[PDB]
Amino acid sequence: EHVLKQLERVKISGQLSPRLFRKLPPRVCVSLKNIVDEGHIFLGFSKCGRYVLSYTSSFYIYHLYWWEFNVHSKLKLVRQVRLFQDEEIYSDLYLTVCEWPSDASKVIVFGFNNHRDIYVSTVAVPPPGCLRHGFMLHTKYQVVYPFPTFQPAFQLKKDQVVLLNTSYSLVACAVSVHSFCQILYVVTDLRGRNLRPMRQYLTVEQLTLDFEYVINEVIRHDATWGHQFCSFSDYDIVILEVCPETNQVLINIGLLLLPKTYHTSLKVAWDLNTGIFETVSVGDLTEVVWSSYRKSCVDMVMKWLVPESSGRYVNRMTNLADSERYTWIVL
Amino acid sequence: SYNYVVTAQKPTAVNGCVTGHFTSAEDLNLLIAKNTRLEIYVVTAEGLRPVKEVGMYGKIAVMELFRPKGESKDLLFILTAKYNACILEYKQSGESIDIITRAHGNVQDRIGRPSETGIIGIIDPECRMIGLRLYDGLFKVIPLDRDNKELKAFNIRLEELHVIDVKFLYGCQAPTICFVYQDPQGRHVKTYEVSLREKEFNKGPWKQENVEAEASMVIAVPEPFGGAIIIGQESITYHNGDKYLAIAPPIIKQSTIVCHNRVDPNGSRYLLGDMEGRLFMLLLEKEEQMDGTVTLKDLRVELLGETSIAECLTYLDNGVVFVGSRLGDSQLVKLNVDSNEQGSYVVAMETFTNLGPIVDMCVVDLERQGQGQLVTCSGAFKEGSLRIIRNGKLHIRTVPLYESPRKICYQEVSQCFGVLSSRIEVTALRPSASTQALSSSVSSSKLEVEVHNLLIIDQHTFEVLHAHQFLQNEYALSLVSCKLGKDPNTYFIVGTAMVYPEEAEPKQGRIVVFQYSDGKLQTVAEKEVKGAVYSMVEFNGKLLASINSTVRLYEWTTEKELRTECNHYNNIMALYLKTKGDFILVGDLMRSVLLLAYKPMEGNFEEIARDFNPNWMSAVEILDDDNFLGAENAFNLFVCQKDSAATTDEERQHLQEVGLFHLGEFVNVFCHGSLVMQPTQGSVLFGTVNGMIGLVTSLSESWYNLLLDMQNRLNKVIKSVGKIEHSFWRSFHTERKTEPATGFIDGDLIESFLDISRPKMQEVVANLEATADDLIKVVEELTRIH
Amino acid sequence: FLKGLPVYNKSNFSRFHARRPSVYLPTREYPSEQIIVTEKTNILLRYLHQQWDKKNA
Numbered sequence A: 001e002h003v004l005k006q007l008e009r010v011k012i013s014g015q016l017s018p019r020l021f022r023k024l025p026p027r028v029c030v031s032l033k034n035i036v037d038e039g040h041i042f043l044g045f046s047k048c049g050r051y052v053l054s055y056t057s058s059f060y061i062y063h064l065y066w067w068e069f070n071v072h073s074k075l076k077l078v079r080q081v082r083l084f085q086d087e088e089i090y091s092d093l094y095l096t097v098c099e100w101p102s103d104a105s106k107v108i109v110f111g112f113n114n115h116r117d118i119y120v121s122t123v124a125v126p127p128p129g130c131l132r133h134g135f136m137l138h139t140k141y142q143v144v145y146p147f148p149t150f151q152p153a154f155q156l157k158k159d160q161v162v163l164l165n166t167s168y169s170l171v172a173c174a175v176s177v178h179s180f181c182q183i184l185y186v187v188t189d190l191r192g193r194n195l196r197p198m199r200q201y202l203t204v205e206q207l208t209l210d211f212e213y214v215i216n217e218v219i220r221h222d223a224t225w226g227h228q229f230c231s232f233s234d235y236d237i238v239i240l241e242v243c244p245e246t247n248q249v250l251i252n253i254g255l256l257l258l259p260k261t262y263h264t265s266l267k268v269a270w271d272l273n274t275g276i277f278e279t280v281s282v283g284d285l286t287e288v289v290w291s292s293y294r295k296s297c298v299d300m301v302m303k304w305l306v307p308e309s310s311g312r313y314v315n316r317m318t319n320l321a322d323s324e325r326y327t328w329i330v331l
Numbered sequence B: 001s002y003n004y005v006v007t008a009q010k011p012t013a014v015n016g017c018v019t020g021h022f023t024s025a026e027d028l029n030l031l032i033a034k035n036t037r038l039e040i041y042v043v044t045a046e047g048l049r050p051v052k053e054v055g056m057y058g059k060i061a062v063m064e065l066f067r068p069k070g071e072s073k074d075l076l077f078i079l080t081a082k083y084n085a086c087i088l089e090y091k092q093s094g095e096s097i098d099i100i101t102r103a104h105g106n107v108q109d110r111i112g113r114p115s116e117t118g119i120i121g122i123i124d125p126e127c128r129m130i131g132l133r134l135y136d137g138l139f140k141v142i143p144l145d146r147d148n149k150e151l152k153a154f155n156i157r158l159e160e161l162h163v164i165d166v167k168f169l170y171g172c173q174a175p176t177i178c179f180v181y182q183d184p185q186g187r188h189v190k191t192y193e194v195s196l197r198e199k200e201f202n203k204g205p206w207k208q209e210n211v212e213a214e215a216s217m218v219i220a221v222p223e224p225f226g227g228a229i230i231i232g233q234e235s236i237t238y239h240n241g242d243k244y245l246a247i248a249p250p251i252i253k254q255s256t257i258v259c260h261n262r263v264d265p266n267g268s269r270y271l272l273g274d275m276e277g278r279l280f281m282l283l284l285e286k287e288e289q290m291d292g293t294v295t296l297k298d299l300r301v302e303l304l305g306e307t308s309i310a311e312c313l314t315y316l317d318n319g320v321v322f323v324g325s326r327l328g329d330s331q332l333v334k335l336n337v338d339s340n341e342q343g344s345y346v347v348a349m350e351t352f353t354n355l356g357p358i359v360d361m362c363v364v365d366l367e368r369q370g371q372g373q374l375v376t377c378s379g380a381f382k383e384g385s386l387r388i389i390r391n392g393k394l395h396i397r398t399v400p401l402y403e404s405p406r407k408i409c410y411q412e413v414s415q416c417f418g419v420l421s422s423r424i425e426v427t428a429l430r431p432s433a434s435t436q437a438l439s440s441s442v443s444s445s446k447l448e449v450e451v452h453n454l455l456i457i458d459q460h461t462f463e464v465l466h467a468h469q470f471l472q473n474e475y476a477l478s479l480v481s482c483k484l485g486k487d488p489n490t491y492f493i494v495g496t497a498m499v500y501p502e503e504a505e506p507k508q509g510r511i512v513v514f515q516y517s518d519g520k521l522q523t524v525a526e527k528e529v530k531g532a533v534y535s536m537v538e539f540n541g542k543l544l545a546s547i548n549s550t551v552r553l554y555e556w557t558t559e560k561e562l563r564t565e566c567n568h569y570n571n572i573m574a575l576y577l578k579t580k581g582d583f584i585l586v587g588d589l590m591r592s593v594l595l596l597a598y599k600p601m602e603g604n605f606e607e608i609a610r611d612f613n614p615n616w617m618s619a620v621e622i623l624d625d626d627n628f629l630g631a632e633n634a635f636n637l638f639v640c641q642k643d644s645a646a647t648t649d650e651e652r653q654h655l656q657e658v659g660l661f662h663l664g665e666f667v668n669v670f671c672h673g674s675l676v677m678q679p680t681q682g683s684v685l686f687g688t689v690n691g692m693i694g695l696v697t698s699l700s701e702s703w704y705n706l707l708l709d710m711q712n713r714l715n716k717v718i719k720s721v722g723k724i725e726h727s728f729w730r731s732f733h734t735e736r737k738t739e740p741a742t743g744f745i746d747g748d749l750i751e752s753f754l755d756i757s758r759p760k761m762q763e764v765v766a767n768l769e770a771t772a773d774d775l776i777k778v779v780e781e782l783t784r785i786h
Numbered sequence C: 001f002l003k004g005l006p007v008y009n010k011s012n013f014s015r016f017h018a019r020r021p022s023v024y025l026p027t028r029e030y031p032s033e034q035i036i037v038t039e040k041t042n043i044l045l046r047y048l049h050q051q052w053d054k055k056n057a
């Protein structure tokens, strides 16, 4: 219905929201022909809309840079990072960066190259303008042949906690600079400023959960078939929903416990505040598979999905358009 | 920078509308929320009489009156825009007025998307619970059991995810809700039986039925009819069990229905208000069933007459109905059994002045003596008027225009108020100030439907001298009156744009310079510009006309034509322009604010600094050469000052927000001036959509610290109805983040001092010594500014 | 559209033809009769806990 009518309607109504402007096409576009580096691979706009991320991946170095953006002026780089330190990468690798819902002091980058390994490293964002403390952690965790699922939205749904599923645990490392989150009641290296100092001051909680121990305890202390099906072969764990209000996480666990082989499911609610608390919430039966469990879990989470405000959301970028500011860069 | 926000004129746009026996069980009361200004009235023989006006620390979003079992008089549930649900009661002991809070507590979820249609609040007819719709997919339910000390609100997932209107049905064993939601197929009606013991919904009765495409509201008919009525554009349907009745009369088709009310207690008569200020009476015809009950045989609607554009209706005793207007003056129209000769059943009795949306304004001093009065542009469609707000209590001269006023700029040489306005044509619906004028002209450029026209108004008597009409399909965007270049005369520069249904964005525009000679306005020159001229402002004698996403400087040549000089394309939508000296302030629609500079040596724009925060600006003002005030869509004020102390190129081009304040109203325009006769250094006037007019004044560091300490001490000694902390109320709040207000002293709270009891005044300064006289003197000095 | 409109008081508005209210600023305050608290527990957790409790019984 045109944009001028919308402005006229806003002037009197007093209600001006981005949603009402969705119908109109983008306001600013960019050719991305002259404003480009030279082998850069752009990853997308920032949540604030003030930078643009990119990486090179020239062993591999895998540098990443910020890019201050202007509608007509050329992009101006601000920062340069390694993001993979002391790691001789002999594989192609797949990068995907994502920012936290509320916290905007750092971003988490992921690397995806018989057993697999994943490179995850946080990088502090440039100061808006202390202004001195900027860090970047590194760490690698190897996964078993049945590689676990990967889902940023719930992994980073916590304000400063990122949940890493290592196929043997659900370690959730929380980093802050400045008093406890993990037990308020995976090896990580230190970097930043081209130095590796001993860890204002930074913090690392790294609270762990034992999947095998939790499953053993649950089956021992629950389940109808406590007189049979001792021990299991393998299992997969997926996070259903994370509740930052009370610091609780939901995990769906599937097993293949056994001359009788059958597939079974399970669920548990782990409370962050009080550590390792496997409060069971479901018990299934063994019937005469992993893809089926994944499909069931995704359907279950979709059924109960509640929309979240645009203010908080885990933006994921990988390889451009800024919906909030109606910006668009065409490649 | 340090500033001081005070309210010159309280808001006068009606937002909330309720009626019920509140003050006592034996007197009718009429309550109006307006914007954070709740007013209590009582119906008397002489008419509505004021009782009290409590100022809640929040924007009233829901008002409901309910009387739980065992209560002599009704309670009052109020939910602010910041989610501060709280039930209130009015207990008076003799001549002492007291309003205790039954219950209070924030009900913000923090994990939900605000609904498109806004906050909806309802209460069960039996008062079993209170239903709140705040976010998509979640329906907060508050139990009302008054036995325990805690009211545990709990959310219930809503599968619809697109609900529009929710209401509690009547005469059901369990509390049910009937609502209309939207799906890709279309809109639908659905019912849920709410359960508090199970904290979940249940399959409701009279299963969902498809509804019209434009269904917009639901009315819950009481017993003995029961059921619900869904009102939609050119469609009214009543759903109840197997019975289903629908009627689509032609009269309704003209406009949509925006408000409703119940006349008869049994729901046999309803009042419907339209966007064109039409009053419809909705009838339900009943028949004697075989069992001996009522079945609502048929439906029918009638046209009572025309009234001011209504945001609410509330029927009062003896046939008089109060019309709560948001885009115009409210009314106390009364229905008449006998029709008028013209065919109107409704005759007005009283009119309450409403400043309405203050689209634009500009202070003038036509009376000399260094005394200024505010001239604004109120009203939206047919209540459009110019309010001459002088200073006595303020005396306001309303000049009706019967058409929407857009802009205003007073020219002193010809002593006339050049004003933009737009009417609606199909041709002319009603006689408007544009239609009748001493002289009229129509654009002769060779370069329903709304007709735009820059018509001039006299300064003395306000008769419209001339009404110039613009090209067909052309919109009048911005207007300015100033002198250009070397010419001795003054022109009426107006920026216009061209609109076509085919395109969704402007692509052609116009910049025309007018001259009002004698009693006629002529076009000396014009310029065609690709785009729409959102805003214009004189800059050092050059017309700094802003086009879509660009800013330009025009030099008025000797050939009396506009020649562009320099441009600055780094913009998303340049909608606001304020200039001081050689500085320019471009307020982007979605890019916060930017500061520019014009270099005479190079004659080109050179961006100097910019605010990188994401904000949706509504108006921008440059308080000084350093402090730039701004107001955003979230009803908050923020001031960002250019920083030169830091010796860094990046820091030099960085604007840091050093002030934050949640004003609580949508600011439309800023203008420099004051209403008093010619401690604080400067004053700025701002107008809101709710009609509130306020002043922003700078303070020295010492005075700001003193007033901040005084306000902090005052908070302890002043009680807030609803138990809402002032710090939380004024704390800058928006979807992205919310931080405590800084650098802004709430003048309204400060003015409360010198009005509190003497022991309270002493307790405020008990150990500050300042005694009490000094505080009173400084407060009176601060008050004297406005 | 005939009229038999309600009359709550036969005398109200009878003498219509033969000023904003004073502001209310309270100094004293009485204890709140009750408090309103939202439920922070995720509804999914509540649903699953209810289902498991029902199964246990």
Ligand SMILES: CNC(=O)C1CCN(C(=O)c2oc(S(=O)(=O)Nc3ccc(Cl)c4c(Cl)c[nH]c34)cc2C)CC1
Pocket: A149, A150, A151, A152, A153, A154, A155, A238, A239, A294, A295, A297, A298, A299, A301, A302, A305
């Ligand atoms: C592979 N299927 C999809 O991508 C579909 C279903 C999931 N989806 C969402 O709506 C959504 O995803 C997340 S998430 O945590 O970032 N990712 C995530 C969550 C939960 C599960 Cl069970 C899985 C599985 Cl299995 C793979 N990724 C998952 C959050 C949300 C609101 C995107 C479309």
